[PDB]
Every structure is written in structure tokens, then in C-alpha cells.
């Protein structure tokens, strides 16, 4: 069989099925092992919904939450995030 999943999604390690948007995003799934970086080659981490953490890092663009300024000298918050 194909065991690669439709183009709208992707197949994890053992030919499973996970949504395309789960690969290179920030969450460690299992495309290759965690489909993070070692899959899409990480072109500037992810040019979809990204914010730049501590001195040029890449975090979720929607990590604001508190409505103030996140990463820069310290992390975004690590409070209301998760």
C-alpha cells in the first residue's frame, strides 16, 4: 500500500496519519521521529505564524496572551502560555 496519507495530511514514522500542519510547527510529533526541523529542513523555523523569541528565536506568533511584550531579554512569559 501507499501508507503515506493524503496530501492534506502526512504519515508519521510507521505510515500513520497526522495533519500536514503538525509537521514543522513547534510540536514534536513523529513524522521522522518528531517531524520537527529534521523534515522541512526548518526554513526560518516556520514562516506561517511565527514570533521571534529571546534574541532571534522562533516561537508561536500567538504566544502573546497577556497583551504585552514577550521574548526579548527573557522568554515570552511562561505563565499564561502553558
Amino acid at each position: 500500500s501507499a501508507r503515506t496519507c493524503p496530501p492534506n495530511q502526512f504519515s508519521c514514522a510507521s505510515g500513520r496519519c497526522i495533519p500536514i500542519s503538525w509537521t514543522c510547527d513547534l510540536d514534536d510529533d513523529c513524522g521522522d521521529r518528531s517531524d520537527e526541523s529534521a523534515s522541512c529542513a526548518y526554513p526560518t523555523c516556520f514562516p506561517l505564524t511565527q514570533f521571534t523569541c529571546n534574541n532571534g528565536r522562533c516561537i508561536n506568533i500567538n504566544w502573546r496572551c497577556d497583551n504585552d511584550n514577550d521574548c526579548g531579554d527573557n522568554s515570552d512569559e511562561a505563565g499564561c502560555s502553558h
Binding site: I18, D29, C53, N54, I59, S75, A78, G79, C80
Partner: protein, 81 residues
């Protein structure tokens, strides 16, 4: 690095150091972080497998996190401060 291949733990680990904490605290924190690290990684695979969809494992994590928060106080702007 090879152990911590996730920025989530990396940024939290350094945050504590940037706030200035003694080695005795950093040691316990590093240990506690390892418990969460493996747990989240396991939970990730679990969720894909369909082992936890109700959010029981994460609820347990939150309870443990409460202990951690009340032990190291690493929150920020929870509401006002």
C-alpha cells in the same frame, strides 16, 4: 543539546537562571523538568495513538505543575503580576 532537543525546555531552563537561582534549586528544577519532558513526549505519542483524548494525563501534569509553581514560583503576569 543532544538531551534537550526541544526549545520549550531550553527557554524555561534559562529563564530560571536569568532570574538567578542557586544550584540546589537548579538541580531539583532540572530533575523536575526531566519528568515533564519525557511525560509530554510520551503523551504526544499517546495522543496520536488515541490513549488520552479527555485530557487526564495533562490534568495530572497540571496538578504536578501547581506543586512546581508553588515550589519555584516561575510564573509571570498570571493576572496582574
Amino acid at each position: 543539546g543532544e538531551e534537550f532537543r526541544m526549545e520549550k525546555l531550553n527557554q524555561l531552563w534559562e529563564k530560571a537562571q536569568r532570574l538567578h537561582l542557586p544550584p540546589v534549586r537548579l538541580a531539583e528544577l532540572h530533575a523536575d523538568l526531566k519528568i515533564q519532558e519525557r511525560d509530554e513526549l510520551a503523551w504526544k505519542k499517546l495522543k496520536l495513538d488515541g490513549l488520552d483524548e479527555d485530557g487526564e494525563k495533562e490534568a495530572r501534569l497540571i496538578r504536578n505543575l501547581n506543586v512546581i509553581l508553588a515550589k519555584y514560583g516561575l510564573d509571570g503576569k498570571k493576572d496582574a503580576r
